[PDB]
Enzyme design. Structure first.
Site, PDB file in Angstrom:
ATOM      1  N   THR B  29       0.650  -1.214   0.120  1.00  0.00           N
ATOM      2  CA  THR B  29      -0.205   0.147  -0.166  1.00  0.00           C
ATOM      3  C   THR B  29       0.675   0.729   0.043  1.00  0.00           C
ATOM      4  OG1 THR B  29      -0.459  -0.721   2.442  1.00  0.00           O
ATOM      5  CG2 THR B  29      -1.930  -1.156   0.936  1.00  0.00           C
ATOM      6  N   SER B  30       0.373   2.926  -0.164  1.00  0.00           N
ATOM      7  CA  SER B  30       0.973   3.363  -0.717  1.00  0.00           C
ATOM      8  C   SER B  30       1.342   4.198   0.891  1.00  0.00           C
ATOM      9  CB  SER B  30       0.045   4.815  -1.037  1.00  0.00           C
ATOM     10  OG  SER B  30       1.007   6.188  -1.432  1.00  0.00           O
ATOM     11  N   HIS B  88       8.000   0.324   4.246  1.00  0.00           N
ATOM     12  CA  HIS B  88       7.572  -1.002   4.679  1.00  0.00           C
ATOM     13  C   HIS B  88       8.719  -1.728   5.167  1.00  0.00           C
ATOM     14  CE1 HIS B  88       3.776  -0.391   3.030  1.00  0.00           C
ATOM     15  NE2 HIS B  88       3.501   0.025   2.268  1.00  0.00           N
ATOM     16  N   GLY B  89       7.861  -2.655   5.848  1.00  0.00           N
ATOM     17  CA  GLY B  89       9.460  -3.403   6.797  1.00  0.00           C
ATOM     18  C   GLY B  89       8.748  -4.620   7.385  1.00  0.00           C
ATOM     19  N   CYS B 130       7.818  -1.455   9.870  1.00  0.00           N
ATOM     20  CA  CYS B 130       7.029  -2.949  10.579  1.00  0.00           C
ATOM     21  C   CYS B 130       8.124  -3.433  10.646  1.00  0.00           C
ATOM     22  CB  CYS B 130       6.146  -3.530   9.929  1.00  0.00           C
ATOM     23  SG  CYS B 130       4.835  -2.075   8.701  1.00  0.00           S
TER      24      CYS B 130
END
Lengths: 94, 141, 119
Positions: B29-30, B88-89, B130
């Site tokens: 996601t954005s 993100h992660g 994340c």
């Protein structure tokens, strides 16, 4: 000859604990970066870096809670995770 | 001494990697609000006299290339190094726009033996990402 | 914020309030901090007509929450055949995996829904 570890003098300031999601708000940004910036602005001239990051931990831990229309994701909490291989105190005003 | 030397001519670099938009193939996601972080970080660190360099929407290859290049710069006049990762992660992982990068690969460039102009100097990695999907239910105070 | 009220109305199943809010320019793809959209809520709570009006006005059929779940995942969990069909018509991705590697087909198998697995 005297040596230091190649892994020495690193600090990894994680937004969240291992295994955990990291929360963000569309308008204000992520909980962690908000708090980090706010604590740096207030304390960079007063506190050592570890103590600034500890204020960030408390700010994120106490002042933020998730809001979701899905109960699965609602009322969730977050603690950041300070990982220090530093060998000295860090003051930004030095 | 008890404190890092911070009176070099320059405070150091503050590299901000700001990944908002991700390739369709990833299904990621954005990251709405990440621009607010990036702007907040630039203001905060420039006021701390850091040389702020913002990078937007970098692929996994671009992240590695950037970090390799930055680690090969002359940091001898710099007190410290800051890198901020906004993406993100997963555990031990940061995402480029097109896929995962091992965080260890990023930070290895700055090892005491590999980035000699930062040996003995604080290297700060600020990781907004994340580390999994686990949610903290909290407990009453 | 109209976007919050839309999410609120969608969850409560207020089809009329949903329509009024959208007429006032409420973002059809409004999100809470967990990435939950009105389409997610309408699919989960089984509000078929609301699902249809959101999609008609350009709701992101493949929006993901923080666990990577799409409205198709949530519709599959409760087993709402009509919502699943409407979502599929608007180009919902059957191959979409959540962060746990599960597809809508995989949820239909785990729920024992034979009618849903074939669709």
């Amino acid at each position: 000859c005297h040596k230091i570890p190649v892994e020495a003098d690193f600090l990894y300031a994680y937004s969240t604990a291992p295994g955990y999601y990291s929360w963000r708000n569309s308008k204000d940004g992520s909980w962690f970066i908000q708090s980090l910036c706010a604590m740096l602005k207030q304390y960079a001239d007063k506190l050592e870096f570890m103590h600034i990051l500890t204020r960030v931990n408390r700010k994120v831990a106490t002042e933020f809670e998730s809001f979701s229309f899905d109960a699965t994701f609602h009322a969730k909490k977050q603690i950041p995770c300070i990982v220090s291989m530093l060998t000295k105190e860090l003051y930004f005003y030095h | 001494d008890n404190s890092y030397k911070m009176d070099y001519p320059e405070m150091g670099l503050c590299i901000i990697i700001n990944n908002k938009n991700f390739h369709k193939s990833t299904g990621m996601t954005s990251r709405s609000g990440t621009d607010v972080d990036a702007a907040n970080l630039r203001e905060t660190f420039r006021n701390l006299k850091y040389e702020v360099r913002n990078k937007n929407d970098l692929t996994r290859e671009e992240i590695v290339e950037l970090m390799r290049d930055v680690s090969k710069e002359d940091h001898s006049k710099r007190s410290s190094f800051v890198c901020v990762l906004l993406s993100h992660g997963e555990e031990g992982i940061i995402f480029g726009t097109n896929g995962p990068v091992d965080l260890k690969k990023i930070t290895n460039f700055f090892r005491g033996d590999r980035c000699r102009s930062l040996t003995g100097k604080p290297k700060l990695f600020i990781i907004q990402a994340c580390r999994g999907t686990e949610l903290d239910c909290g407990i009453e105070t | 914020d109209l976007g919050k009220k839309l999410l609120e109305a969608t969850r409560a199943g207020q089809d009329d309030e949903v329509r009024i809010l959208m007429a006032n320019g409420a973002d059809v793809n409004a999100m809470d901090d967990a990435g939950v959209t009105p389409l997610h809520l309408a699919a989960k709570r089984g509000h078929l007509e609301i699902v249809e009006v959101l999609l008609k006005h350009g709701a992101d059929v493949n929006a993901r929450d923080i666990w990577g779940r799409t409205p198709l995942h949530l519709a599959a969990t409760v087993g709402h055949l009509e919502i699943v069909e409407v979502l599929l018509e608007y180009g919902a991705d059957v191959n979409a995996q959540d962060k746990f590697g599960k597809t809508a087909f995989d949820i239909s198998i785990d729920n024992g829904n034979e009618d849903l697995a074939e669709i």
